[PDB]
Design a protein around this ligand. Sequence first.
Ligand SMILES: [Zn+2]
Ligand SMILES: [Zn+2]
Ligand SMILES: [Zn+2]
Length: 107
Amino acid sequence: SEAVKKWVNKIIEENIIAVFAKTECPYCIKAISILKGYNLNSHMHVENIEKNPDMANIQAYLKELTGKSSVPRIFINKDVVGGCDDLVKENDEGKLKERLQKLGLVN
Ligand SMILES: [Zn+2]
Ligand SMILES: [Zn+2]
Ligand SMILES: [Zn+2]
């Protein structure tokens, strides 16, 4: 479905921070909380792909884009961060902050 890919693409392109998530997903919640802790709400969109008729197609496309079909799937300015574990690694190592500084999102 070109439609599914167009829709996922629009989410990633229109929002600097894009998080694909699902219902009652602890690592989704943890990742979103970390990101909101950088006061990124204004530039973030969270998409619940479980409440969607095309969940399997969305997951398959996220795997084509990132190598994994699991949520959360995290993009920052169209770059693949990955899952919550990847976010925690980048955060602890300083990379996340560096990303956000280069985007003008944190001073
Ligand atoms: Zn579920
Ligand atoms: Zn429940
Ligand atoms: Zn949405």
